[PDB]
């Protein structure tokens, strides 16, 4: 989108159009001027020794610090890498040593609010200068820095560089394993240290990964190395300010590959046997067992990876994120255990509810038809009453409440994206409200119950099409009728409704008054009649040259002909082309959308259950893995024939 905008830049080589010794020093450090550096430092020290001792450190720092932002000559030298930067770095460090300012000088930080908190080690590590990083780390550097500020903590991507506000995080995110090892070995580096939002190095690595495989073993390898060399089950347990762990964060942001690696991370090497989650039990060829860990990947605690992966619509990579067992096996087990039967019961109850509405609407023509009303509570009807009158009115509320909650909990910015069941949550609620209001209307006198009851019946019969997601083959349609009617038949109206309006008045103006023939006498009378006739022309009912027309018959005929040739073709057969394109696009992608909707329904029904039954319908055992650990489990026996065949073919040939 639009380029981001920042305050004063870090290093401005090209001076804009908007004290001597400091500028001399900055220019000298910018390029290779070793002799100039020596002379400038000599004269600077001679000037410095002109006053009392206590002001020597402050004066030296002020002379070597740019008051505009707080930049130090060392940072300028590091930023402008030249084939002889090492010598100037050595000279500056020695000069700092002379006056005993090897401290603050090294650990200098910006002052401008944009790049606040930066330090020399960050710049040294960024520019690949590993040797300078080692020198600074040894001498006096402070690894536990925090590069806060807008530039290092943008509101979103494409507006800054977020890496973790820590030298170790920057080294890991810029693919510098050697610097990572050097920093980790140093005792001062505390690996677990949340910086700004709440993020240990693992979260920083997760939030800069790629959404798929291109060639990058970089992020995955760095994450694995950090987790291993850490040697503790602690990094993957911390939480950020929003309360997420690296696994949950990877699931939420949509980074599929880190999630895949971390769900099934196996450590064959002995003596760890605890940071893994895929304890393999036995394997005899194609058949392979496993003991995947469900400690935080089952909808129990509050925010299991499954719920975050299913109930989020920001990303569109979810189709590959639900075949990353134990997610797939969990969904299958729930579906075959407690979610299909509830789905069928809901279908049957809704169908009988609609049939009851219709049979108390038409079969009996709502009554004897004298001065009647529907169900209400009138007794003395027996069998048809206690079922017909009650079951509807009760069950209607049972919907109005449930969906009423859903719309209340609907998050607009995310859930309004269609294909997230909102288009049905609205219609169910509208139908229930219509039935309730239909009853309440006549309940006083209000003889208008009909319109509302008929609207409710029509909406209910139309919405009963929602339940076609239970069958795989006839499940795509329920998506098309949405995707089309909000992608090709809604943006199309804003075009059509122009022409129909345009010619709607035009034709209505050429007409001439003929009250003489006892009535209208002409097909195109008022605006409404002209619009209706144009619509019937668009669908096709008939036309003819209308008499009683003034200022021309030819103009009227020409206008009608051009409307017909401009709407019945070249518009309708263009909307149809767009509709065909949309159907083709959303017909190949049938498995993904259907499976996603089935998962959403399964999770919704699982939530609907009470705590008792849900506790009964748990999955897993109490695996004892390594000498202290009791973690949940899910024994899933996988079988892979093609993979085993290709492996054995390419192995022993």
Ligand X SMILES: CCCc1cc(O)c2c(c1)OC(C)(C)[C@@H]1CCC(C)=C[C@@H]21
Applying the rule CB under 6 A, the residues between 449 and 468 that interact with ligand POV are none
Applying the rule CB under 6 A, the residues between 154 and 173 that interact with ligand X are none
Residue 150 burial (C-beta neighbours within 10 Å; 0-12, 13-18, 19+): middle
Q: Kindly state the tokens that stand for 508.
A: 């209505």
Applying the rule CB under 6 A, the residues between 549 and 568 that interact with ligand X are 562, 566
Of 619, 621, 622, 624, the C-alpha closest to 273 is 624
Q: Is 613 in the site for ligand X (CB under 6 A)?
A: no
Measured between its terminal Cα atoms, the distance across the chain in Å is 54
With CB under 6 A as the contact rule, the residue among 284, 383, 444, 494 that binds ligand POV is 494
Q: Is 458 in the site for ligand X (CB under 6 A)?
A: yes
Q: Is 261 in the site for its own copies (CB under 8 A)?
A: no
Of 276, 274, 277, the C-alpha closest to 292 is 277
Residue reference for tokens 């029509």: 458
CB of residue 532 to ligand POV, shortest distance in Å: 4
Of 124, 222, 118, 123, the C-alpha closest to 180 is 222
Q: Is 427 in the site for ligand X (CB under 6 A)?
A: yes
Which range, of 180-188, 283-291, 411-419, 440-448, touches ligand POV by CB under 6 A?
411-419
**Gap between the Cα atoms of 176 and 604, Å rounded:** 45
If one counts every other C-beta atom within 10 angstroms of the C-beta of residue 172, the result is 28
Applying the rule CB under 6 A, the residues between 564 and 603 that interact with ligand POV are 565-566, 568-569
The answer to whether 540 is a known ligand-binding residue is yes
Nearer to ligand X, 26 or 461 (CB): 461
Residue 47 binding result from ligand X, its own copies, ligand POV, none, given CB thresholds of 5 to 8 Å by partner type: none
Q: Is 202 in the site for its own copies (CB under 8 A)?
A: no
If one counts every other C-beta atom within 10 angstroms of the C-beta of residue 267, the result is 17
Binding mask 80-119 for its own copies (x = CB under 8 A): ----------------------------------------
Q: Is 47 in the site for ligand X (CB under 6 A)?
A: no
DSSP class of residue 469?
G
Q: What is the DSSP string of 411-422?
A: -HHHHTSSSSSH
Q: Is 269 in the site for its own copies (CB under 8 A)?
A: no
Q: Is 563 in the site for ligand POV (CB under 6 A)?
A: no
Binding mask 7-26 for its own copies (x = CB under 8 A): --xxxxxxxxxx--------
Which range, of 26-34, 293-301, 309-317, 457-465, touches ligand X by CB under 6 A?
457-465
Residue positions counted in the chain: 653
Nearer to ligand POV, 191 or 481 (CB): 481
With CB under 6 A as the contact rule, the residue among 462, 474, 490, 555 that binds ligand X is 462
Nearer to its own copies, 267 or 480 (CB): 480
Applying the rule CB under 6 A, the residues between 374 and 413 that interact with ligand X are none
Please tell me the number of Cα atoms within 13 Å of 318 on its side-chain side.
24
Q: Is 509 in the site for ligand POV (CB under 6 A)?
A: no
Asked if 214 contacts 274 with a C-beta cutoff of 8 angstroms, the reply is: no
With CB under 6 A as the contact rule, the residue among 56, 66, 333, 418 that binds ligand POV is 418
**Per-residue H/E/C for 106-128:** CCCCCCCCCCCCCCHHHHHHHCC
Q: Is 59 in the site for ligand POV (CB under 6 A)?
A: no
Residue 427 binding result from ligand POV, its own copies, ligand X, none, given CB thresholds of 5 to 8 Å by partner type: ligand X
Residue reference for tokens 């040294």: 124
Task: Tell me how many degrees the CA angle 514-518-521 measures, rounded to the nearest 5.
Answer: 45
**Gap between the Cα atoms of 65 and 261, Å rounded:** 47
Q: Is 387 in the site for its own copies (CB under 8 A)?
A: no
Asked if 275 contacts 287 with a C-beta cutoff of 8 angstroms, the reply is: no
Q: Kindly state the tokens that stand for 457.
A: 């019946």
* φ/ψ (deg, to 5) at 625: -100, -65
**Total residues interacting with its own copies, rule: CB under 8 A:** 142
**Gap between the Cα atoms of 390 and 387, Å rounded:** 6
Residue 323 binding result from ligand POV, ligand X, its own copies, none, given CB thresholds of 5 to 8 Å by partner type: none
Which range, of 40-48, 58-66, 418-426, 543-551, touches its own copies by CB under 8 A?
543-551
Residue 646 binding result from its own copies, ligand POV, ligand X, none, given CB thresholds of 5 to 8 Å by partner type: its own copies
Of 232, 162, 152, 175, the C-alpha closest to 203 is 162
With CB under 6 A as the contact rule, the residue among 407, 495, 577, 626 that binds ligand POV is 407
Q: Kindly state the tokens that stand for 378.
A: 């009138």
CB of residue 512 to ligand POV, shortest distance in Å: 15
Nearer to its own copies, 150 or 397 (CB): 150
CB of residue 40 to ligand POV, shortest distance in Å: 48
Q: Is 474 in the site for ligand POV (CB under 6 A)?
A: yes
Q: What is the DSSP string of 477-506?
A: HHHHHHHHHTTTSSTTHHHHHHHHHHHHHH
Radius of gyration of the chain (CA): 37
Q: Is 81 in the site for ligand POV (CB under 6 A)?
A: no
b vs e for 517-540, b when ≥16 Cβ sit within 10 Å of the residue's Cβ? eeeebbbbbeeebbbebbeebbee
Q: Which residues contact 103 (CB under 8 A, 6 or more apart)?
A: 140
Q: Is 231 in the site for its own copies (CB under 8 A)?
A: no
**Gap between the Cα atoms of 644 and 642, Å rounded:** 6
* φ/ψ (deg, to 5) at 638: -85, 150
Residue 268 binding result from ligand X, its own copies, ligand POV, none, given CB thresholds of 5 to 8 Å by partner type: none
Nearer to ligand POV, 61 or 333 (CB): 333
Q: Which residues contact 607 (CB under 8 A, 6 or more apart)?
A: 299
Binding-site residue ranges for Na(+): 540
Q: Which residues bind ligand X (CB under 6 A)?
A: 427, 458-459, 462-463, 465, 481, 562, 566
Q: Which residues bind ligand POV (CB under 6 A)?
A: 1, 332, 338, 341-342, 344-346, 349-350, 355, 358, 362-363, 398-399, 402, 407, 412, 416-419, 428, 470-474, 483, 486-487, 494, 496-497, 500, 505, 526-529, 531-532, 535, 538-539, 545, 553-554, 557-558, 561-562, 565-566, 568-569, 608, 613
Binding-site residue ranges: 540
């Amino acid at each position: 989108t639009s380029p981001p905008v920042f305050s004063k830049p870090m290093d401005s080589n090209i001076r804009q159009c908007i004290r001597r010794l400091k500028k001399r020093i900055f220019a000298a450090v910018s390029e290779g001027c070793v002799e100039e550096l020596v002379e400038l430092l000599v004269e600077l020290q001679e000037l410095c020794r002109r006053r009392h001792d206590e002001d020597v450190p402050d004066f030296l720092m002020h002379k070597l610090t740019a008051s505009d932002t707080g930049k130090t000559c060392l940072m300028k030298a590091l930023l402008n890498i030249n084939p002889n930067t090492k010598e100037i770095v050595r000279i500056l460090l020695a000069f700092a040593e002379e006056n005993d300012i090897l401290g603050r000088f090294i650990n200098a930080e910006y002052t401008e609010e944009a790049y606040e908190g930066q330090t020399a080690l960050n710049i040294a590590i960024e520019r690949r200068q590993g040797d300078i990083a080692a020198l600074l780390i040894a001498a006096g550097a402070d690894v536990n820095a925090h590069a806060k500020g807008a530039f290092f903590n943008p509101k979103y991507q494409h507006e800054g560089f977020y890496f973790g506000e820590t030298p170790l995080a920057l080294a890991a995110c810029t693919n510098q394993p050697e610097i990572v090892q050097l920093l980790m070995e140093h005792e001062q580096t505390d690996i677990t240290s949340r910086d700004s939002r709440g993020n240990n190095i693992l979260h920083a690595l997760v939030t800069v990964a790629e959404d798929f495989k291109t060639q990058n073993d970089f992020v995955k390898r760095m994450y694995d190395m950090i987790l291993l060399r850490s040697g503790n089950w602690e990094l993957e347990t911390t939480r950020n300010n929003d309360g997420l762990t690296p696994l949950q964060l990877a699931a939420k942001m949509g980074k599929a590959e880190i999630l895949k690696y971390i769900l099934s991370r196996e450590i064959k090497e002995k003596r760890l046997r605890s940071l893994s989650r895929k304890f393999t039990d036995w394997a005899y060829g194609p058949v392979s067992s496993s003991l995947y860990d469900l400690t935080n990947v089952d909808t129990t605690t509050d925010n299991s990876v499954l719920e975050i992966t299913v109930y989020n619509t920001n990303i569109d990579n979810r189709h590959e994120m639900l075949t990353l067992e134990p997610l797939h096996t969990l969904l299958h087990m729930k579906w075959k255990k407690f979610a299909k039967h509830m789905f069928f019961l809901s279908f049957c109850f809704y169908f009988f509810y609609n049939i009851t509405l219709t049979l108390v609407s038409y079969y009996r023509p709502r009554e004897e038809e004298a001065i009647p009303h529907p169900l209400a509570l009138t007794h003395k009807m027996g069998w048809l009453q206690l079922l017909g009158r009650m079951f509807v009115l009760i069950w209607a509320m049972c919907i109005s409440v449930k969906e009423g909650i859903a719309i209340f909990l609907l998050r607009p910015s995310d859930l309004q994206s269609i294909l997230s069941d909102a288009w049905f949550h609205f219609v169910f609620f509208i139908q229930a409200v219509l039935v309730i209001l239909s009853v309440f209307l006549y309940l006083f006198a209000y003889k208008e119950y009909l319109a509302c009851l008929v609207l409710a019946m029509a909406l209910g019969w139309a919405n009963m099409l929602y339940y076609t997601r239970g069958f795989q083959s006839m499940g795509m349609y329920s998506v098309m009728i949405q995707k089309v009617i909000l992608h090709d038949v809604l943006k199309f109206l804003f075009v059509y409704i122009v022409f129909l309006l345009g010619f709607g008045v035009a034709l209505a103006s050429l007409i001439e008054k003929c009250p003489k023939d006892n009535k209208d006498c002409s097909s195109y009378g008022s605006f409404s009649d002209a619009v209706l006739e144009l619509f019937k022309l668009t669908i096709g009912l008939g036309d003819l040259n209308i008499q009683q027309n003034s200022k021309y018959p030819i103009l009227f005929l020409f206008l009608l002909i051009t409307y017909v040739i401009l709407t019945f073709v070249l518009l309708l057969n263009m909307l149809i082309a767009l509709m065909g394109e949309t159907v083709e696009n959303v017909s190949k992608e049938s498995e993904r959308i259907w499976r996603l909707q089935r998962a959403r329904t399964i999770l919704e029904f699982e939530k609907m259950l009470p705590e008792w039954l849900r506790s009964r319908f748990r999955m897993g055992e109490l695996c004892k893995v390594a000498e202290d650990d009791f973690r949940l489990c899910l024994r899933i026996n996988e079988v892979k024939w093609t993979e085993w065949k290709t492996h054995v073919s390419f192995l022993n040939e």
